[PDB]
Fold Probable glutathione reductase.
Amino acid sequence: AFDYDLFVIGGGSGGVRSGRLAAALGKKVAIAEEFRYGGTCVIRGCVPKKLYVYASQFAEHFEDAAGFGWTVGESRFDWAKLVAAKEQEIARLEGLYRKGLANAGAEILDTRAELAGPNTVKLLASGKTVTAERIVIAVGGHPSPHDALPGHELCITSNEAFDLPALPESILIAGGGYIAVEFANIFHGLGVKTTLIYRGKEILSRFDQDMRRGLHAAMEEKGIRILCEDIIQSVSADADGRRVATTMKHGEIVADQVMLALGRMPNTNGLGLEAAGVRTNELGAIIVDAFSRTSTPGIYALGDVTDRVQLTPVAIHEAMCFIETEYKNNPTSPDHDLIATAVFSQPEIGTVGITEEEAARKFQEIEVYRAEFRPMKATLSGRKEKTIMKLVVNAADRKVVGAHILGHDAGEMAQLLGISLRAGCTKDDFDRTMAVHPTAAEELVTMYQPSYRVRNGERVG
Amino acid sequence: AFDYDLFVIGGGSGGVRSGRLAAALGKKVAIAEEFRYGGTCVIRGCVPKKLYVYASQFAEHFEDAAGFGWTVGESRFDWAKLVAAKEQEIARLEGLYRKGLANAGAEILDTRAELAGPNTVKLLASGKTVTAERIVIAVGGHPSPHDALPGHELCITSNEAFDLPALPESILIAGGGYIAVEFANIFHGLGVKTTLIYRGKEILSRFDQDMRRGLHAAMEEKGIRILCEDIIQSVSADADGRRVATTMKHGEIVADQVMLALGRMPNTNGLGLEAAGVRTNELGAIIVDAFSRTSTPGIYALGDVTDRVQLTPVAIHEAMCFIETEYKNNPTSPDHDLIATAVFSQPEIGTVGITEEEAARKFQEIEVYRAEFRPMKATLSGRKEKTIMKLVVNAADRKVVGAHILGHDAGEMAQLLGISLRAGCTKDDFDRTMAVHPTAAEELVTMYQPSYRVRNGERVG
Ligand SMILES: Cc1cc2nc3c(=O)[nH]c(=O)nc-3n(C[C@H](O)[C@H](O)[C@H](O)COP(=O)(O)OP(=O)(O)OC[C@H]3O[C@@H](n4cnc5c(N)ncnc54)[C@H](O)[C@@H]3O)c2cc1C
Ligand SMILES: Cc1cc2nc3c(=O)[nH]c(=O)nc-3n(C[C@H](O)[C@H](O)[C@H](O)COP(=O)(O)OP(=O)(O)OC[C@H]3O[C@@H](n4cnc5c(N)ncnc54)[C@H](O)[C@@H]3O)c2cc1C
C-alpha cells in the first residue's frame, strides 16, 4: 500500500474539486499548491476580472443616468480602494476553498510539488518523498514569456494587472484574445487612454465575423485606438519610468504601462514529465485520453495543463468525470462538444456553436438571421451602441448551429442558448417561441426571414 | 363592393399589425385610432414602463458603486425631465407606427369608430358612415374604474401615473398584480415613500411560491410597506390636497397619491356591438373562437379586448394568425401554451411554464431544483440581495415543466428558457450543457441533485 490513494498537484479549479470529492468518499488524499488556493480563476482570472468589469461599468451608468432625469454629482474613482476590496474577497474565497478540503477530510499542503518516480511525488517545501496510487496533475498555465523581445521585464501581465501601484493615465495592450480585449474595456471605462496592438487582421480571430467586426467598431467609436496587423519590436523606458514601445508600422508609443496578453502556456517546465513518462505535445501541453489519463498509468491530467479548452467549468467537469470513473465505479468521458462562452468586453460577447465561416465550410446551404439595433436604454441614455444578434442555421435539417450576441447581458444569454443548441433545437423552435416584451432576446424569436444565405461558400441572400 | 376590404378599429399593437400586414398585401384597408397610434404598450404600457424602471434602477447603481472604489457625490432626480424624455420617445415611436402604415398603403384616420350594421362602420369625428368586407376589433381595454369606491375620483391609474404633474412624496398603491408591483418599485426607486395594499393573501397570486414570497421579502426589506388581506373602505381629500384612505385593518393612511392598479376592462361600452349582434361575456370582453372570430361572420376580435392573455406579443401573434387565416387560406390558431413572461419589478421576475403547486397536482412525482444565492456583484456592493432560480421537472419524463427566476435579467432569461421549454427540453439536456462562468445562469445547469421531491402532491421530508 502507498502513502495516499490520491495526490493532487495544483490547488486550482480542477484539483480542488478532484481532491475534495475524493476525500468526501473516505479516500486518503493529499493536495499541493505553490501559490494560493482557488487557482487562477478565483485569484487572478474570472473572479477579479469580472469584479473589475463591474467597476469599469459604473462610469457608463453615471452618464446614462442624465438621460433619465438624474443630475449626478462629481464622481471619483480610487484604484487603491478597488484593489483593497478585491483582495479581501479573494482572501475570503480562498478561505472557503481551503475549508472545503479540510471538511471533506483531505490533507492540505503548502508547496510546489514535482514528479519523481512513476508514482512518487517530490515535495519542495519540506523536501520529502510521498507515494500515491493515483496522481492528478491539475497544474494549469501562466502568461506567455516573450523573453526574446527586449524589455519584457518592464511589462506586465494578467498576474499583476490587478495589483498595480496606480491607475495609469495610458496603457498599451498587445494581443487580440479575450483577456486582451477585456482589460482594454476595463481600463478605458476607468478613464485610461487605451491602445490595442495585434498581429492578426481582425481581433478575436476565432469568433464570428460579426462579433469580431462589431466589437472593433464600437471600441474604436468609444475611443480605443486599435492597430491591427502590427507588432512591438522592443520596450524600453524613458527617464520618467514610463514605457516606450517600438512598433513596426505605427511608429513609437509612450505609455504608463505595457501589457502582454498574447496567449498562455502550461506550467510544465521541470515538473518531472520525462522522469515519470508523461507524453507532452509541442505546445508544451499534456496529452491525455477520454478519461484524462496520461501516458503513465497512475497519472491523470486535467484543466489548462492539457491545452484543450481553457475555461473553469471545463476543469470542473473533468474533475467530476475523473472521480466517477476512478472511484464511483461509473466510467464517464468529459464532453467538449458545443461549449458556450463569454467575453466580458464592453459591449459583451456571448457565443455558442460554430462561426459563419466555419458553418459555411461544414455545410452546403446555411441561413443567416441577423439583428442590429439601438438597445432601449440607449434610446434615452443617448449612447451610440448597437446590439448585434446573429443566428447561423443549417438549411438541410433547420438546425441552429451557431448563436452570437453582442450587447448587454450577452454572457447570460450565451449560457441559455447553450442548452438550446445542445438539444439540437431548430430555427423553427425559435420561431414558435412566444416573444417576451420588452426584452432584447425577443429579437431571436421573430426573425422569420433570413438576412441572407450562403451556398457553396458564397453569400447570396 | 365595399368601401374597404378591411376596417380595423383600434390603433394599438393588434390593430396596427393587422392593418399594416393586410395593406401590404394590396388590400383596401382603413384604420381608426381615437387617441394615439401605437396603443397602450407604446404610449402608457410596456415601453414607458420599462423606461421608468431604468430611471428607478440608477438609485441603486449610485450606492452600489461605493463598494467598487467609487465615491459619487449626491445625485438628484428631476421628474419633469424623465416625463419629458419619455414623451420625446413615445412621440417618435407613435410617428414610426404612423409612417409604417402609410408606407404599406393603409388609410389612417384619427377618430373613434363605432359599429352600424355588421359590415358598416361609423366614424364619429367626421360623422360619416363606411362599409368594409371584413372588420377587426382591436380595441383593447382600459384601467378599471371602481365607481363603487367612495372618492375614487381622487385616485390615479397607470394612465395618469406616467404623467403626474409632480412627483408625489408619498404614494399608496392598491393592487397585487404585475402593474401594482412594477409601479411600487418604480416609485420607491425614485424616493417616493411607497405603500402597497392588496385584498388577497399574497402578491402576484398566479406566480410560483418562491417568486411571490421572494419578491415580497426583497420589497419590504428595502423599505416598502406591504399590506396583505386588506381593502380600501374609502378615499377622501384632506385640507392640504393630500389623500386620506380608509382601511378595514390598518386604519387611515395619508399619501400624496392613491393609485388603483386592480385590473383592466375592455372598451366595449357604446361600441355598437349590440347593434351588430357581437356576443359579449359578463366581464364585458368579446367572445371569440381560436381564430379570433366574433359571433358575427364578417367580424374578428383580437388583443386585450378578448378576455385572453393580456400581453402585447399575444396581440401581435393573434393578428398574424388572423392575416394567415382570413387571407392566406392557412387556418391556424394563436392559442398557445407555455408563454414565458417577465415582471419588471426589482428584483425582476422571469417565468416560463407552470408553478410548483400546479405541477404537484398535475403529475404524481416531480423533482424541484432550487438555487438561492448572493449575486456576484453583491459580494462587493454589500447589497443584501438573493437570487432565486427554480426549475420544476416531471419525474416520469425528465421534462422541465417550469422555470422561475427572481433576480437580475430574469426577463431575458425567461425568453431564452422559453425556447427550451417550447421544444420540450429535459433536465438532462440542461445537465449536459457546459457551464458559462462567471454567470448567474450557470446555476441552472449544475444542480445535478434535486433539492427536494414531491410525490402525490406532498413533499418528501
Ligand atoms: C485574465 C484571465 C481571465 C479569465 N477569465 C475566465 C472566465 O471568464 N471564464 C472561465 O471559465 N475561465 C477564465 N479564465 C481561465 C481559468 O482561470 C482557467 O481556465 C481555470 O482556472 C483552469 O483551472 P485549472 O485548475 O486547470 O488551473 P488553475 O486554476 O490555474 O490551477 C493551478 C494551480 O496550481 C498551482 N500550481 C502550479 N504548479 C504547481 C506545482 N508544481 N505544485 C503545486 N501547485 C502548483 C498554481 O499556483 C495554480 O494556482 C481566465 C484566465 C485568466 C488568466
Ligand atoms: C402599465 C402597463 C404595463 C404593461 N406592460 C407590459 C409588458 O411589459 N409586456 C407586455 O407584453 N405587455 C404589457 N402590457 C399589456 C399591453 O400593453 C397590451 O396587452 C397590448 O397593448 C394589447 O394591445 P391591443 O391590440 O389589445 O390594443 P391596445 O394596445 O390596448 O390599443 C388599442 C387602441 O384602440 C383604441 N380604441 C379603443 N376603443 C376604440 C374605439 N371604440 N374606436 C376607436 N379606437 C379605439 C385605444 O385607445 C387603443 O389605442 C402592459 C399594460 C399596461 C397597462
Notes: Chain A touches chain B through 79 residues (CB under 8 Å). Residues A 9-15, 32-35, 39-41, 45-46, 49, 112-114, 138-140, 158, 179, 267, 271, 303-305, 310-313, 315; B 437 surround flavin-adenine dinucleotide (ligand 1) (CB under 6 Å). The domain at 1-143+263-337 of chain A is CATH 3.50.50.60 (FAD/NAD(P)-binding domain).
